[PDB]
Write a protein that binds this ligand. Structure first.
Ligand SMILES: [Mg+2]
Ligand SMILES: [Mg+2]
Ligand SMILES: [Mg+2]
Ligand SMILES: [Mg+2]
Ligand SMILES: [Mg+2]
Ligand SMILES: [Mg+2]
Lengths: 140, 156, 140, 156, 140, 140, 140, 140
């Protein structure tokens, strides 16, 4: 995309053309083999706008001089978007069956927090010190 | 003419997709898919999107001997078309639409279709399966069968 | 929209036009692919009105001079609204079955508290310090 | 002539293997196997390999009395052939092909085969069963019946 | 591939010819007997682009005078790509069933972090000290 | 094979003729009763090249001036290749069922470590001190 | 068996006649009532060649002046060969089923390591001190 | 038999006539209600020859000046042989089912070591201090 997803905040996202916004949505749809094709544009756009705001609020700032978002903010925002899109449909698909055909996806309980509950969340979690409290400060 | 499809599932998809936007009862023309086009956790439409028809062949196709010559098979095929929507009136209207769409071609001579007969043979309602407490898809279906003379290799 | 969900209190919501309420409802309805379309307007309006009131009462004020609502108040109030609609529908589906076929959503047991019991709650929970009590005060 | 095998499963393997490369529709000739040639987790082709056909006898063969001589049995023999591939159109081409290939021989007076009759009698689609998330095998099949007179050595 | 996957950064990956990028995809696709053939080219491209990005931004630098990546950076990036593709497809099948017959794949529960959760991840994990914090440093 | 699998590094493997490379592949195929016959040449070759590169990088160097690899490097690289080839198809099959009838393979399951996940891995693991950390050093 | 399995190393095995290899194979094939007959000759040769090499590398030398291979080296190498063949056949059957009827072999989970995972391994394990570290040494 | 099974070592066993050897095999077959009739002569002979060698290596000698084989060596060698013959076929059958008719054999988990895994092993185990130590020495 012309603006990459890490360049733009919530206020910037609302200013985008349909084409810029569609190119970013297309980039997110690459993260799933089904591309979430039955879920409408508005919902994917809302998930991205949420992921952008949530990055800028919960995952900006620092722990020591180090940024709290250590990895590539592009892929962090894409995974956080894909995580939210999945959670707009339902949980993780642990088990799927229809017309006798059946599959189960080895998920496990995984813990308790939102990012732990889906594969895109568990990828996003490595970018942000896995939500650990490594912040350190002193008297001067 | 309207299909020339190599197999019955694609033939019925082609017939449903060849329907004019005027011949559906709803405001939006439905989307036609193979049952295997979508995974289960995301099967059926999202909100603010047109309703979905899933097509597949649910039971054994038969190849009866037509005659002592062995030059052709009396092929009989079966298909189910399921309609999924959140709207209980919309699946009812779609079921009626699929019936009165696929009742064209009822006695082709391989003119539009590659068959002698495409017929709705039964209809199922499954609305009673949808739990009322949650939002969730209603489902209804048309069972449709298809018969034709299918060429053998015996006489080259 | 013209207003936003973070720019109104319970008293203001009741004074919004129908259109302004409906646009906020239309934003909340983006948080599920299913849109909760078979649950009526009044239930979605009530879930939002309650989420606004519950933010302003239970999830407001300061904790060690920080805001307790540090996350984006817009998306927080949306997630709290979507959470409330989901509990108005009886909660998270663990499992579903029908002539469409069958699916399971990997939840496990999880925590005891309302925000731990649904995915929208678990998303809201990160905007409010995961309900932790880091508040601190001194003699003067 | 073309098979002369002691049992129907090997006979249909020999018929499918004897088929010219020009009479398969896909770019490359499929591989023919007994169902029990492969372990389950390995069953079906890998990527960059041609599609695979699994042959076996799914049900009891009948030995009917032909006459009160007791000289011969009217043997009626059942086979299924499954086509496995990752391509949803290739399995359909293979179904089409298997029906054509096995519709030669349709009334041998034991000319090529050791039978009076080898016929496709039905076909199945199982493409609906493959999940949409995972890459994985589509499966389709042909059901085949074989008939012939089989000697008893009652009179010797 | 003539430019190897370890000889290229995200900036280089976007700058490769179609054929060079495709040769690297063609290499990655060798890591599964199923080849991920029913997931598109662009999805596999995005997975590799993301894997290169995480190598460069999360699995780079030093842990004492050691590198934080100890194994072959080629095969590490391949495993990281394969791991991403499998999560784009929903993860490991613990079980599969249909008219083909049935199988179960002995996964158990396993770990909680994304590399622990999948076979390609578990292969990559040994390349990166199993994610342990073995770095040491002194005052100067 | 004339060039044994321990007489070659990654640079050598890429320089081998088709025959020389196929003799090693032919030896690897003895390690499974099924011989992995549905998996293509290129995937077996990629697995062996990976096993060679992994041996030379992750399983090289001394440990307490003993070698980090104690067992025969031929059979280690073979079992490491077989281990990788299995993981290119899936896990160990815990259970398999055909048209009728069933079998289960008593695996039980080890931890998150890939070498515990398969039969060839659990053999290769004895060659490399069971991944134990008996390395030792002193001041002079 | 004019020569025998403990009277040869890997280099000697390659130098034996076909008959002497096949005789040692014929002796190993006695260790199962099933003889592993539907696994080909080459795989049984390979399992023996590997067992010989793995004995001489991993299960040789002394511990507190005791031999580490205290048990009869003939039967040890046979059990190690039978163990290797059984892992080439996919492991221990926990359960078997068909039109013959059904049977289950009481295995439980057992240990994590290869020799614990099969009955032939569990026999070989007693010949080599159950892999315990009895070794001891003094200063002079 | 003329030579009882406790009188003869591995070297003596090979010197036996067919009649002496058959009489010993016949004595072992008395330990099973089926007599293992489907399992061939060579396999039963190999199991006995192994049991003799394993007695003479692992279960000869002394601890605290007591013999490590305390019980009747005849019945110990018979049980050790029956244990091996059983393991040449499979485990204990915990469960069996035929033409609908079914039975299960109260085995339990039983531990880990090969003698614990089967009934003939659990009989043999009492003869040899149950693989416990009582070993003692002093300075002189
Ligand atoms: Mg980590
Ligand atoms: Mg958190
Ligand atoms: Mg390790
Ligand atoms: Mg060990
Ligand atoms: Mg012991
Ligand atoms: Mg006792």
């Amino acid at each position: 995309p012309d603006p990459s997803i890490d360049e733009v905040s919530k206020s910037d996202w609302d200013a985008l053309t349909t084409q810029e916004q569609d190119d970013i949505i297309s980039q997110v749809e690459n993260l799933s083999s089904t591309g979430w094709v039955n879920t409408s544009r508005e919902r994917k756009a809302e998930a991205i706008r949420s992921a952008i705001a949530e990055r800028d609020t919960l995952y900006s700032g620092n722990m020591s001089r180090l940024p709290t978002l250590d990895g590539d903010a592009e892929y962090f925002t894409l995974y956080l978007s894909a995580h939210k899109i999945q959670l707009f449909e339902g949980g993780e698909a642990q088990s799927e069956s229809g017309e006798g055909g059946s599959v189960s996806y080895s998920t496990g309980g995984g813990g308790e927090k939102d990012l732990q509950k889906t594969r895109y969340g568990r990828m996003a979690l490595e970018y942000v010190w896995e939500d650990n409290s490594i912040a350190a400060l002193r008297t001067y | 003419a309207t299909t020339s499809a190599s197999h019955h599932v694609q033939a019925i998809i082609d017939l449903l997709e060849a329907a004019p936007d005027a011949d559906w009862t709803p405001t939006q023309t439905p989307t036609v898919k193979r049952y295997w086009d979508d995974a289960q956790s995301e099967r059926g439409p999202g909100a603010d999107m047109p309703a979905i028809l899933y097509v597949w062949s649910p039971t054994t196709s038969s190849l009866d001997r037509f005659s002592m010559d062995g030059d052709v098979f009396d092929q009989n095929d079966s298909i189910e078309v399921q309609a999924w929507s959140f709207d209980e009136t919309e699946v009812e209207q779609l079921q009626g639409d699929i019936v009165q769409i696929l009742s064209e071609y009822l006695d082709d001579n391989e003119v539009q279709t590659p068959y002698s007969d495409v017929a709705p043979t039964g209809t199922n309602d499954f609305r009673e399966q949808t739990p009322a407490r949650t939002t969730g898809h209603y489902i209804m279906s048309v069972e449709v069968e298809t018969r034709g003379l299918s060429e053998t290799a015996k006489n080259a």
